[PDB]
Amino acid sequence: SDQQLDCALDLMRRLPPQQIEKNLSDLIDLVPSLCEDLLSSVDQPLKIARDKVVGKDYLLCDYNRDGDSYRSPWSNKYDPPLEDGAMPSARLRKLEVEANNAFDQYRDLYFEGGVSSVYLWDLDHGFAGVILIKKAGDGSKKIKGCWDSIHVVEVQEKSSGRTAHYKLTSTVMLWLQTNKSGSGTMNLGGSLTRQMEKDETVSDCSPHIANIGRLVEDMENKIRSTLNEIYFGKTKDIVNGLRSVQTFADKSKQEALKNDLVEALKRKQ
């Protein structure tokens, strides 16, 4: 049933990014023996939890999925009440609380709201973390958007000397809508994923978390940019290439002179 899995992933690849959760559950309802085989490479939105003791929010994924509970980084507690989970290193717990702090600053600077979370775990010669960012559109506004970001980062620290090897994998799951009069309703799905790795020197002024912050910042700038120009301009190009606004036989004139100049440019070769 391995070909069945390949076609299943391609089906999710071509599936409409509006009902990712429901249709993923449906596809799992086909072959439930292949269920938690798909929940590793099928990108879907996030789940907002609620830290009761702190009064914050924290997102849900597999990295915080300790057993079947979730480690709330604002409290380092598990919900459902599992007092047998895998607590992170106390060292990494302090590094994680400052990580959550720095990314709250990051999130507030670019997203001006939204929910974020940064979990962490070990490595033999380093550590690794995940960065969840979920920005839903302004509910008051008509723009029904939902920015979703997941950043798999793996700090492969070298021997000593404080130089590292920062491996990072990201993912953006966009969502957009406008109920504008000129467009009626213009829905706009979309999703990206990239990888980047750099070896920035670690120091007392340049900790690991700062290097990760620069990488996440650059990565999201590239993804948002890349999206907006390449992919969205590509869609605009497709709509313009399908139907043209200019009347034909006028386009035959401009394309006529265009082919004339094609002959002119390829005439003096």
Binding site: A86, M87, S89, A90, R91, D122, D124
Partner: protein, 341 residues
């Protein structure tokens, strides 16, 4: 062993409190009046408080090698730190020092006031002290002090470790516990050294020496099985704490295996003498091997390890060779004694 340094206050403040002491009035903060909100006054106050912070930090962060000195020295050192940090809290809680703090608070200078409790590591030092405070009081090391009988040592070793079992709730470090164990073995070795001294073991018969031998291995087995129980104890402690994957060394070479190995070589040594001296009695090879036996073995000399290998590895295999060469005749002699007929 621990510096206990008092906190000096400015002399004019002492004269003011002295003036209030002549009356019985509590020396108020605003007694200085205009002198409170002045630059040089608060300047000198912060100078004194800053030196106080350095005096506290002089002894709070103090630490030495956990295996430096004997076991009782390190254990008593932690005890000294406990009571000494309480004395630092005593000097902190006096109303005169609080009066200086009130001067800096009333003069809107929050720096020395907040740093008097945060910059001083006395708070965290006292909380760790209190975490180790019941663990350091009523330690049964005296059970190990006057224990000359190996049975007293058996029950003593089990008692001390069962009292030490409360380190599951007080976060005991790994390497600290291992150096602690080696310190325990240090005193065990010292006690056994004088025990072998007051035993006159080189002259007793194999009956009493056999009983003493078995008692020695009794103590050693109490060490091994109870130490494995302490090993499993610390294993589950590290599991319940969930901190990291350090390269923790459990390859412990304590102070008692050093004598245990020599005992083992003597066990097989007595096997040679057992079959021989127990039967040979039954032509002068009988006498002659007991002659050469005692001649190459009567000089163990308080059986320390250093000279043990240093000269006794040669004298040891030399004793083997003295049997052998001495016993060399009997083989071919037996070939005579019975092969002729």
């Amino acid at each position: 062993e621990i510096p206990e340094i008092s906190l000096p206050i400015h002399p004019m403040i002492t004269n003011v409190a002295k003036q209030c002491y002549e009356r019985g009035e509590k020396p108020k903060v605003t007694d200085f009046g205009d002198k409170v909100e002045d630059p040089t006054f608060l300047n000198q106050l912060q100078s004194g408080v800053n030196r106080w912070i350095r005096e506290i930090q002089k002894v709070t962060k103090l630490d030495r090698d956990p295996a430096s000195g004997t076991a009782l020295q390190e254990i008593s050192f932690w005890l000294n730190l406990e009571r000494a940090l309480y004395r630092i809290q005593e000097k902190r809680e006096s109303p005169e020092v609080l009066l200086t703090l009130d001067i800096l608070k009333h003069g809107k200078r929050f720096h020395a006031t907040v740093s008097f409790d945060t910059d001083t590591g006395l708070k965290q030092a006292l909380e760790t002290v209190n975490d180790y405070n019941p663990l350091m009081k009523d330690f049964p090391l005296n059970d190990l002090l006057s224990a000359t009988e190996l049975d007293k040592i058996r029950q003593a070793l089990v008692a001390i470790f069962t009292h030490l079992r409360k380190i599951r709730n007080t976060k005991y470090p790994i390497q600290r516990a291992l150096r602690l164990v080696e310190a325990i073995s240090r005193d065990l070795s010292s006690q056994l050294l004088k025990v072998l001294g007051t035993r006159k073991l080189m002259h007793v018969a194999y009956e009493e020496f056999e009983k003493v031998m078995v008692a020695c291995f009794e103590v050693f087995q109490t060490w091994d099985d109870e130490y494995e129980k302490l090993q499993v104890l610390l294993r589950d402690i590290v599991k319940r704490k969930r901190e990291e994957n350090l390269k923790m060394v459990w390859r412990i070479n304590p102070a008692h295996r050093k004598l245990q190995a020599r005992l083992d070589q003597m066990r097989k040594f007595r096997r040679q003498h057992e079959q021989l001296r127990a039967v040979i009695v039954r032509a002068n090879a009988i006498e002659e091997v007991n002659l050469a036996y005692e001649n190459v073995k009567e000089v163990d000399g308080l059986d320390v390890s250093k000279e043990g290998t240093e000269a006794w590895e040669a004298a040891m295999k030399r004793y083997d060779e003295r049997i052998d060469r001495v016993e060399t005749r009997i083989t071919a002699r037996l070939r005579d004694q019975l092969g002729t007929a």
